[PDB]
mmCIF file of C-alpha atoms and ligand atoms in Angstrom:
data_model
loop_
_atom_site.group_PDB
_atom_site.id
_atom_site.type_symbol
_atom_site.label_atom_id
_atom_site.label_comp_id
_atom_site.label_asym_id
_atom_site.label_seq_id
_atom_site.Cartn_x
_atom_site.Cartn_y
_atom_site.Cartn_z
ATOM 1 C CA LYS A 1 23.221 84.737 76.889
ATOM 2 C CA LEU A 2 21.276 87.617 78.168
ATOM 3 C CA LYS A 3 21.919 88.561 81.941
ATOM 4 C CA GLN A 4 19.159 90.254 83.914
ATOM 5 C CA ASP A 5 21.554 93.184 85.059
ATOM 6 C CA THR A 6 22.493 93.998 81.373
ATOM 7 C CA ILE A 7 18.633 94.208 80.686
ATOM 8 C CA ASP A 8 18.258 96.279 83.745
ATOM 9 C CA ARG A 9 20.874 98.713 82.623
ATOM 10 C CA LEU A 10 19.793 98.969 78.976
ATOM 11 C CA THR A 11 16.195 99.405 79.992
ATOM 12 C CA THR A 12 17.168 102.309 82.046
ATOM 13 C CA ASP A 13 19.919 103.851 79.859
ATOM 14 C CA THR A 14 18.209 103.505 76.381
ATOM 15 C CA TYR A 15 15.009 104.432 74.528
ATOM 16 C CA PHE A 16 14.201 100.651 74.126
ATOM 17 C CA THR A 17 11.808 98.447 76.135
ATOM 18 C CA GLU A 18 12.548 95.272 77.720
ATOM 19 C CA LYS A 19 10.635 93.507 75.039
ATOM 20 C CA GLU A 20 12.286 95.351 72.081
ATOM 21 C CA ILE A 21 15.806 94.628 73.698
ATOM 22 C CA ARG A 22 15.015 90.943 73.996
ATOM 23 C CA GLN A 23 13.728 90.888 70.358
ATOM 24 C CA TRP A 24 17.034 92.616 69.262
ATOM 25 C CA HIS A 25 19.002 89.990 71.219
ATOM 26 C CA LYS A 26 17.678 87.067 69.537
ATOM 27 C CA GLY A 27 18.468 88.646 66.134
ATOM 28 C CA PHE A 28 21.784 89.808 67.391
ATOM 29 C CA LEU A 29 22.711 86.240 68.349
ATOM 30 C CA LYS A 30 21.400 84.638 65.207
ATOM 31 C CA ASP A 31 23.845 86.735 63.151
ATOM 32 C CA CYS A 32 26.543 86.887 65.810
ATOM 33 C CA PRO A 33 26.688 83.537 67.588
ATOM 34 C CA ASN A 34 29.813 84.577 69.740
ATOM 35 C CA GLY A 35 27.869 87.796 70.783
ATOM 36 C CA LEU A 36 30.499 89.824 69.042
ATOM 37 C CA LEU A 37 29.850 92.015 66.112
ATOM 38 C CA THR A 38 33.059 92.562 64.130
ATOM 39 C CA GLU A 39 34.021 95.180 61.304
ATOM 40 C CA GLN A 40 33.610 92.477 58.847
ATOM 41 C CA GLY A 41 30.149 91.641 59.714
ATOM 42 C CA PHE A 42 29.214 95.241 60.408
ATOM 43 C CA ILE A 43 30.465 95.996 56.674
ATOM 44 C CA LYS A 44 28.282 93.115 55.349
ATOM 45 C CA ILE A 45 25.167 94.663 57.257
ATOM 46 C CA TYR A 46 25.769 97.811 55.094
ATOM 47 C CA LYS A 47 26.617 96.014 52.028
ATOM 48 C CA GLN A 48 23.039 94.470 52.469
ATOM 49 C CA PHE A 49 21.456 98.111 52.015
ATOM 50 C CA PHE A 50 23.980 99.590 49.564
ATOM 51 C CA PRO A 51 24.824 96.884 46.936
ATOM 52 C CA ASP A 52 25.314 99.472 44.251
ATOM 53 C CA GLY A 53 28.381 101.247 45.741
ATOM 54 C CA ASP A 54 30.914 100.189 48.237
ATOM 55 C CA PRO A 55 29.659 101.046 51.841
ATOM 56 C CA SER A 56 33.069 99.648 53.290
ATOM 57 C CA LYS A 57 34.751 102.933 54.409
ATOM 58 C CA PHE A 58 31.450 104.479 55.614
ATOM 59 C CA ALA A 59 30.620 101.350 57.629
ATOM 60 C CA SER A 60 34.241 101.315 59.132
ATOM 61 C CA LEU A 61 33.626 104.990 60.157
ATOM 62 C CA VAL A 62 30.329 104.276 61.922
ATOM 63 C CA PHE A 63 31.939 100.901 63.397
ATOM 64 C CA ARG A 64 34.398 102.744 65.392
ATOM 65 C CA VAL A 65 31.717 104.849 66.974
ATOM 66 C CA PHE A 66 29.681 101.864 68.014
ATOM 67 C CA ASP A 67 32.737 100.193 69.265
ATOM 68 C CA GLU A 68 33.114 102.567 72.326
ATOM 69 C CA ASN A 69 35.814 100.648 74.212
ATOM 70 C CA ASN A 70 37.791 100.249 70.767
ATOM 71 C CA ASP A 71 38.486 96.496 71.250
ATOM 72 C CA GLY A 72 37.479 95.815 67.511
ATOM 73 C CA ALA A 73 34.166 94.191 68.538
ATOM 74 C CA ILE A 74 30.619 95.391 69.131
ATOM 75 C CA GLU A 75 29.051 93.415 71.949
ATOM 76 C CA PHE A 76 25.256 93.613 72.351
ATOM 77 C CA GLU A 77 25.251 96.421 74.880
ATOM 78 C CA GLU A 78 27.534 98.735 72.690
ATOM 79 C CA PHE A 79 25.087 97.815 69.804
ATOM 80 C CA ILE A 80 21.651 98.677 71.510
ATOM 81 C CA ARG A 81 23.165 102.014 73.139
ATOM 82 C CA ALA A 82 24.446 103.368 69.826
ATOM 83 C CA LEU A 83 21.276 102.218 68.209
ATOM 84 C CA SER A 84 19.123 104.000 70.782
ATOM 85 C CA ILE A 85 20.920 107.340 70.200
ATOM 86 C CA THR A 86 20.908 107.276 66.461
ATOM 87 C CA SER A 87 17.299 106.028 66.004
ATOM 88 C CA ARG A 88 15.546 107.664 69.065
ATOM 89 C CA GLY A 89 17.967 110.239 70.422
ATOM 90 C CA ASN A 90 16.949 113.962 70.796
ATOM 91 C CA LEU A 91 18.571 116.527 68.647
ATOM 92 C CA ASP A 92 21.474 117.212 71.051
ATOM 93 C CA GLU A 93 22.285 113.299 71.346
ATOM 94 C CA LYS A 94 22.200 112.883 67.570
ATOM 95 C CA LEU A 95 24.325 115.837 66.886
ATOM 96 C CA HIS A 96 26.879 114.708 69.597
ATOM 97 C CA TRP A 97 26.967 111.285 67.962
ATOM 98 C CA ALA A 98 27.243 113.068 64.581
ATOM 99 C CA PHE A 99 30.182 115.017 65.969
ATOM 100 C CA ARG A 100 31.911 111.728 67.153
ATOM 101 C CA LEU A 101 31.574 110.329 63.655
ATOM 102 C CA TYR A 102 33.369 113.285 61.852
ATOM 103 C CA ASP A 103 35.891 113.377 64.591
ATOM 104 C CA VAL A 104 37.821 110.459 63.246
ATOM 105 C CA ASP A 105 40.945 110.563 65.463
ATOM 106 C CA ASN A 106 38.823 111.463 68.487
ATOM 107 C CA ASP A 107 40.733 114.599 69.408
ATOM 108 C CA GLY A 108 37.507 116.619 70.037
ATOM 109 C CA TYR A 109 37.806 118.753 66.933
ATOM 110 C CA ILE A 110 36.528 118.394 63.243
ATOM 111 C CA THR A 111 39.036 119.439 60.712
ATOM 112 C CA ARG A 112 38.235 120.031 56.998
ATOM 113 C CA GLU A 113 40.050 116.629 56.070
ATOM 114 C CA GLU A 114 37.807 114.556 58.458
ATOM 115 C CA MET A 115 34.726 116.240 56.982
ATOM 116 C CA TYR A 116 36.183 115.392 53.343
ATOM 117 C CA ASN A 117 36.689 111.890 54.709
ATOM 118 C CA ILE A 118 33.067 111.208 55.669
ATOM 119 C CA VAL A 119 31.625 112.962 52.663
ATOM 120 C CA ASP A 120 34.038 110.658 50.379
ATOM 121 C CA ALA A 121 32.765 107.623 52.304
ATOM 122 C CA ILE A 122 29.216 108.788 51.808
ATOM 123 C CA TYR A 123 29.849 109.185 48.043
ATOM 124 C CA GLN A 124 31.477 105.750 47.596
ATOM 125 C CA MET A 125 28.595 104.027 49.523
ATOM 126 C CA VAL A 126 26.056 105.751 47.204
ATOM 127 C CA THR A 127 32.922 120.857 43.120
ATOM 128 C CA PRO A 128 32.294 118.785 46.262
ATOM 129 C CA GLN A 129 35.255 120.009 48.258
ATOM 130 C CA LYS A 130 34.024 123.659 47.560
ATOM 131 C CA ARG A 131 30.706 123.130 49.023
ATOM 132 C CA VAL A 132 32.325 121.445 52.047
ATOM 133 C CA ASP A 133 34.954 124.157 52.734
ATOM 134 C CA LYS A 134 31.978 126.745 52.445
ATOM 135 C CA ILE A 135 30.099 124.818 55.134
ATOM 136 C CA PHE A 136 33.132 124.437 57.172
ATOM 137 C CA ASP A 137 34.353 127.988 56.679
ATOM 138 C CA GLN A 138 30.776 129.046 57.951
ATOM 139 C CA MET A 139 30.907 126.809 60.965
ATOM 140 C CA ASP A 140 34.428 127.789 61.986
ATOM 141 C CA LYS A 141 33.892 131.087 63.890
ATOM 142 C CA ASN A 142 37.388 131.879 65.329
ATOM 143 C CA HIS A 143 38.892 130.913 62.047
ATOM 144 C CA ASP A 144 41.330 128.190 63.465
ATOM 145 C CA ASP A 145 40.381 125.256 60.971
ATOM 146 C CA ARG A 146 38.833 123.231 63.754
ATOM 147 C CA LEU A 147 35.303 122.706 64.552
ATOM 148 C CA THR A 148 34.680 122.077 68.279
ATOM 149 C CA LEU A 149 31.555 120.194 69.512
ATOM 150 C CA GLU A 150 29.880 123.687 70.291
ATOM 151 C CA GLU A 151 30.989 125.033 66.764
ATOM 152 C CA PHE A 152 29.369 122.045 65.136
ATOM 153 C CA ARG A 153 26.298 122.092 67.228
ATOM 154 C CA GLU A 154 25.343 125.674 66.660
ATOM 155 C CA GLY A 155 26.311 125.422 62.992
ATOM 156 C CA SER A 156 24.167 122.490 62.360
ATOM 157 C CA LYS A 157 21.114 123.980 63.969
ATOM 158 C CA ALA A 158 21.447 126.800 61.433
ATOM 159 C CA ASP A 159 22.790 124.727 58.626
ATOM 160 C CA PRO A 160 21.701 121.042 58.875
ATOM 161 C CA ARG A 161 23.123 119.635 55.747
ATOM 162 C CA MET A 162 26.194 118.035 57.213
ATOM 163 C CA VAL A 163 24.067 116.287 59.825
ATOM 164 C CA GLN A 164 21.117 115.213 57.701
ATOM 165 C CA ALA A 165 23.539 113.562 55.335
ATOM 166 C CA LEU A 166 23.960 111.044 58.183
ATOM 167 C CA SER A 167 20.252 110.544 58.389
ATOM 168 C CA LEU A 168 20.218 112.261 62.096
ATOM 169 C CA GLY A 169 18.446 115.662 61.392
HETATM 170 C C1 LIG B 1 25.888 108.111 59.980
HETATM 171 N N1 LIG B 1 25.114 107.029 60.340
HETATM 172 C C2 LIG B 1 24.790 107.302 61.702
HETATM 173 C C3 LIG B 1 23.694 106.109 62.282
HETATM 174 N N2 LIG B 1 22.568 106.043 61.267
HETATM 175 N N3 LIG B 1 21.674 104.874 61.824
HETATM 176 C C4 LIG B 1 22.195 103.811 62.402
HETATM 177 C C5 LIG B 1 23.140 102.862 61.267
HETATM 178 N N4 LIG B 1 22.565 101.704 60.957
HETATM 179 C C6 LIG B 1 22.680 100.513 61.573
HETATM 180 C C7 LIG B 1 22.861 100.465 63.064
HETATM 181 C C8 LIG B 1 23.262 99.286 63.636
HETATM 182 C C9 LIG B 1 23.136 98.200 63.020
HETATM 183 C C10 LIG B 1 22.899 98.103 61.701
HETATM 184 C C11 LIG B 1 22.760 99.092 60.987
HETATM 185 S S1 LIG B 1 22.396 99.101 59.196
HETATM 186 C C12 LIG B 1 21.633 100.743 58.826
HETATM 187 C C13 LIG B 1 20.896 100.855 57.691
HETATM 188 C C14 LIG B 1 20.275 101.848 57.120
HETATM 189 C C15 LIG B 1 20.379 103.038 58.003
HETATM 190 CL CL1 LIG B 1 19.689 104.516 57.876
HETATM 191 C C16 LIG B 1 21.119 102.906 59.414
HETATM 192 C C17 LIG B 1 21.886 101.838 59.700
HETATM 193 C C18 LIG B 1 22.855 105.844 60.003
HETATM 194 C C19 LIG B 1 23.790 106.986 59.712
HETATM 195 CA CA1 LIG B 2 33.588 97.034 71.762
HETATM 196 CA CA1 LIG B 3 39.539 115.154 64.767
HETATM 197 CA CA1 LIG B 4 36.955 126.742 65.239
#
């Protein structure tokens, strides 16, 4: 069930009110009786808004960011925290979240491949490499074929295309 200390934490750490959090919890438990949102279920959530294409790979990429302790489950607290950031975060928070989405192997850098990875995922859910390379080449200042968080942040606050594609701009 929903412990008071979970509520206390979430009402302090997120942009949701206690009432909203309780409303989300009833819905969360209805869909996930064990309190655990799995990758399978997360995909079916996306399949519900993108029946046209195949949002499997995009949803999987989003899943690993939601799942912050990497145990293969999104518990309710992980769910609310990620939802808070992506729907109500300030520009810096949404950028940082965006960065973690692109940084697939979580090494703190975005490579071209990883940027290809996401754009492909977006495509399957809904020349392309050339436009990406162009934007990546523009963001990569010291020309090392990596994008640090700072390179990605400043690049997006000048060319927000890579970020808006994630509906976070
Ligand atoms: C790259 N991503 C970053 C996060 N962004 N927002 C949150 C994702 N999210 C969602 C979140 C939790 C549970 C279910 C869903 S389903 C859903 C449907 C449409 C949208 Cl536009 C977003 C979502 C969508 C774009
Ligand atoms: Ca987890
Ligand atoms: Ca990486
Ligand atoms: Ca760089």
